[PDB]
């Protein structure tokens, strides 16, 4: 099922196959991947799963499943999406190990990489 952070997988007999996740109080997302309380990243943010979604300029992030992001090298439909923390949302991530968490942004006609605003817990 893949429900992370102690989530548990549920289904219902009266409704065919559908299974989803029951996530602990402070974790969201389909698989509980979303750390609903974090307010800063440790290290370079590679393992950051918070809900920040705005860049340095205050612009919103494109969702990791946008038709556009789907043309980039890091998007929600990758076999490893879940592991990179890229999902049906627009939260800052760092799937390529850059210095700090980022996300693509619609800058003119270009989906450019932009570092977000959140800082080190340091």
């Amino acid at each position: 099922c893949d429900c992370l952070n102690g989530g548990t997988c549920v289904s219902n007999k009266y409704f065919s196959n559908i299974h989803w996740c029951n996530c602990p109080k402070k974790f969201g997302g389909q698989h509980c991947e979303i750390d609903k309380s974090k307010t800063c990243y440790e290290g370079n943010g590679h393992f950051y799963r918070g809900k920040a979604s705005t860049d340095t300029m205050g612009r919103p992030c494109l969702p990791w499943n946008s038709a556009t992001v789907l043309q980039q090298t890091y998007h929600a439909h990758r076999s490893d999406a879940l592991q990179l923390g890229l999902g049906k949302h627009n939260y800052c991530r760092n799937p390529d190990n850059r210095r700090r968490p980022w996300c693509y942004v619609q800058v003119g006609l270009k989906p450019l990489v932009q570092e977000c605003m959140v800082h080190d817990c340091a």
Partner: protein, 265 residues
């Protein structure tokens, strides 16, 4: 020959041509609703005829889960989305008690958004990775409605109480071992014919509460779709097979101790 839409929960669809004995395409949806925000999972595929339109929603402290399933039987009727359905508005919506095993709440209250919806108590114990909840209380419409039905054997206990009166689904959590000895005895088994339901793998279980009929049921289960029998104690359990994810099913009840012997067919 009928064709449907198959859509694995992620959104990746494709057109499905239905295997024979599958006269309906269907759309299954779970809307997890918590504090403003909301996830929605959508699954579509062909399905077996016995399938009906159904809804179930329960409250799990600040969260509300809404399962819904709709079946139709025409080419790609499984495609719809924004043509809109029937927008209700009542003066006095029916209120039921609501809870789930998930946060061990089974409690809060729930307003049923539709008039065909009733109050529900669904018990599902020790039967079929993912896992159904033990206890669930809320609003919805499912097979057994209205009334109540039950079954139990060596491996399982299933109970559905469906009722129209206000907060009528309230009361103490129903555990099997608090039902009084029914006085009847029936056989119990599962699995394959000669492999799990043989004359000498089934034994007499002492039935409990309103479960006094002795049933036998045959149909098709999983992992693939092999034949599959079930023997136990029942009430007014018939078309109620998804409480075993059994299809192409034909139940049977008799009201005499041991009457559901494999030798007695």
């Amino acid at each position: 020959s009928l064709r449907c839409m198959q859509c694995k929960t992620n959104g990746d669809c494709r057109v499905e041509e239905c295997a024979l004995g599958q006269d309906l395409c269907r759309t299954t949806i779970v809307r997890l609703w918590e504090e403003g925000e909301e996830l929605e999972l959508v699954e579509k595929s062909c399905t077996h005829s016995e399938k009906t339109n159904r809804t179930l929603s329960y409250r799990t402290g600040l969260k509300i889960t809404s399962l819904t399933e709709v079946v139709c039987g025409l080419d790609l009727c499984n495609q719809g989305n924004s043509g809109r359905a029937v927008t209700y508005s009542r003066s006095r919506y029916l209120e039921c008690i609501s809870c789930g095993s998930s946060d061990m709440s089974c409690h809060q209250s729930l307003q049923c958004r539709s008039p065909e919806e009733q109050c529900l108590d669904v018990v599902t114990h020790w039967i079929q990775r993912p896992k159904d909840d033990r206890h669930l209380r809320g609003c919805g419409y499912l097979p057994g409605c209205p009334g109540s039905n039950g079954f139990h054997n060596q491996d399982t206990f299933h109970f559905l109480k469906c009722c129209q009166t206000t907060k009528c689904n309230e009361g103490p959590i129903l555990e099997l071992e608090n039902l009084p000895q029914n006085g009847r005895q029936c056989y119990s088994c599962k699995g394959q014919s000669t492999h799990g339901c043989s004359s000498e793998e089934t034994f007499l279980i002492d039935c409990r509460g309103p479960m006094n009929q002795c049933l036998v049921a045959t149909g098709t289960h999983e992992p693939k779709q092999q034949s599959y029998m079930v023997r136990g104690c029942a009430t007014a359990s018939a078309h109620l097979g998804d409480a075993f994810s059994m299809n192409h099913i034909d139940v049977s009840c008799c009201t005499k101790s041991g009457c559901n012997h494999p030798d007695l067919d």
